[PDB]
Design an enzyme around this catalytic site. Structure first.
Site, PDB file in Angstrom:
ATOM      1  N   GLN A  68       1.006  -1.231  -0.049  1.00  0.00           N
ATOM      2  CA  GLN A  68       0.074   0.010  -0.057  1.00  0.00           C
ATOM      3  C   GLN A  68       0.932   1.227  -0.127  1.00  0.00           C
ATOM      4  O   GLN A  68       0.399   2.319  -0.560  1.00  0.00           O
ATOM      5  CB  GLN A  68      -0.993   0.034   1.138  1.00  0.00           C
ATOM      6  CG  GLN A  68      -0.509   0.368   2.356  1.00  0.00           C
ATOM      7  CD  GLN A  68      -1.532   0.217   3.399  1.00  0.00           C
ATOM      8  OE1 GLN A  68      -2.111  -0.869   4.052  1.00  0.00           O
ATOM      9  NE2 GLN A  68      -2.094   1.168   4.342  1.00  0.00           N
ATOM     10  N   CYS A  95      -5.577   1.127   3.213  1.00  0.00           N
ATOM     11  CA  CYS A  95      -5.588  -0.414   3.802  1.00  0.00           C
ATOM     12  C   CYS A  95      -7.221  -0.866   3.560  1.00  0.00           C
ATOM     13  O   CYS A  95      -7.419  -1.869   2.938  1.00  0.00           O
ATOM     14  CB  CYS A  95      -5.081  -0.544   5.142  1.00  0.00           C
ATOM     15  SG  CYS A  95      -6.530   0.245   6.388  1.00  0.00           S
ATOM     16  N   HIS A 147      -6.644  -1.241  11.068  1.00  0.00           N
ATOM     17  CA  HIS A 147      -5.834  -1.729   9.875  1.00  0.00           C
ATOM     18  C   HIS A 147      -6.733  -2.768   9.331  1.00  0.00           C
ATOM     19  O   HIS A 147      -6.816  -4.018  10.095  1.00  0.00           O
ATOM     20  CB  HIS A 147      -4.367  -2.017  10.441  1.00  0.00           C
ATOM     21  CG  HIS A 147      -3.681  -2.721   9.164  1.00  0.00           C
ATOM     22  ND1 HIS A 147      -3.323  -1.792   7.967  1.00  0.00           N
ATOM     23  CD2 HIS A 147      -3.082  -3.749   8.964  1.00  0.00           C
ATOM     24  CE1 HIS A 147      -3.088  -2.674   7.100  1.00  0.00           C
ATOM     25  NE2 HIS A 147      -2.552  -3.735   7.643  1.00  0.00           N
ATOM     26  N   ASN A 179      -1.968  -9.523   4.181  1.00  0.00           N
ATOM     27  CA  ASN A 179      -1.746  -8.072   4.502  1.00  0.00           C
ATOM     28  C   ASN A 179      -1.324  -7.431   3.418  1.00  0.00           C
ATOM     29  O   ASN A 179      -1.132  -7.951   2.365  1.00  0.00           O
ATOM     30  CB  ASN A 179      -0.546  -8.122   5.549  1.00  0.00           C
ATOM     31  CG  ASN A 179      -0.250  -6.551   6.281  1.00  0.00           C
ATOM     32  OD1 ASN A 179      -1.351  -5.779   6.202  1.00  0.00           O
ATOM     33  ND2 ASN A 179       0.589  -6.725   7.062  1.00  0.00           N
TER      34      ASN A 179
END
Ligand SMILES: *[C@@H](C(=O)O)[C@H](O)C(=O)N[C@@H](CC(C)C)C(=O)NCCC(C)C
EC number: 3.4.22.2
Length: 212
Positions: free
Chosen positions: A19, A25, A159, A175
């Protein structure tokens, strides 16, 4: 519901992304679920646009956050463009959906998992990748580099990530840090702690798209 689920094996998850320096996110989370669901229905695995969510979700706040639920809400109404055609720039700009032709995909609605119930989360992941949040600002988390992660960590979730699997002892998470983080970009978070919040607050807020 099997003892094991790993959507990567059934070719339902795309390469891991980074990212960068933007707090998008929430958009990356949302895209993991869209990409999952489309492949589950059509048999095609496509890459979809994080940048578009970033530029068009009024209701979120571009870089420096938003909501995957909002995000999934927009593809249901409108649609989303392929990642090729609307590339990630890691900067919020004007919403150019229009400039880019017809949508490549459209979803049919959004649903939220019953919060603080491992059972309910496990059921959904059995059906398709799901959008989930956790507390990532602690340094144990940032420092993770392979492993069954049991914290330490708190419950102040900040997150969004995506759950794409689970085991007897963990939940699998993709992730949006590079491939260089945790396990080739993934994290196995310990489950069945019997804490309602989940490790790092994992059961606080999960969503997945609905399609035909
Ligand atoms: C996640 C990322 O690291 O990119 C991103 O920062 C994010 O979306 N964070 C937020 C969740 C949505 C509410 C934006 C955020 O607000 N940060 C704190 C989260 C809770 C309010 C504690």
């Amino acid at each position: 519901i099997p003892e094991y689920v790993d959507w990567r094996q059934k070719g339902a998850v795309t390469p891991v992304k980074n990212q960068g320096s933007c707090g998008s996110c929430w958009a990356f989370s949302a895209v993991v679920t869209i990409e999952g669901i489309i492949k589950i229905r059509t048999g095609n695995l496509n890459q979809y646009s994080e940048q578009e969510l970033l530029d068009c979700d009024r209701r979120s706040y571009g870089c420096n956050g938003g909501y995957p639920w909002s995000a999934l809400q927009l593809v249901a109404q409108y649609g989303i463009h392929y990642r090729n055609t609307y590339p990630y720039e890691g900067v919020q700009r004007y919403c150019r959906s229009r400039e880019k032709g017809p949508y490549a995909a459209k979803t049919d609605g959004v649903r939220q998992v019953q919060p603080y119930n491992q059972g309910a989360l496990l059921y959904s992941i059995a059906n398709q990748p799901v959008s989930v949040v956790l507390q990532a600002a602690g340094k144990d988390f940032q420092l993770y580099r392979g492993g069954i992660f049991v914290g330490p960590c708190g419950n102040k979730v900040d997150h969004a990530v995506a759950a794409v699997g689970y085991g007897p002892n963990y939940i699998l998470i993709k992730n949006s840090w590079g491939t260089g983080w945790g396990e080739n970009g993934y994290i196995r978070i310990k489950r069945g702690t019997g804490n309602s919040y989940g490790v790092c607050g994992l059961y606080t807020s999960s969503f997945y798209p609905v399609k035909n």
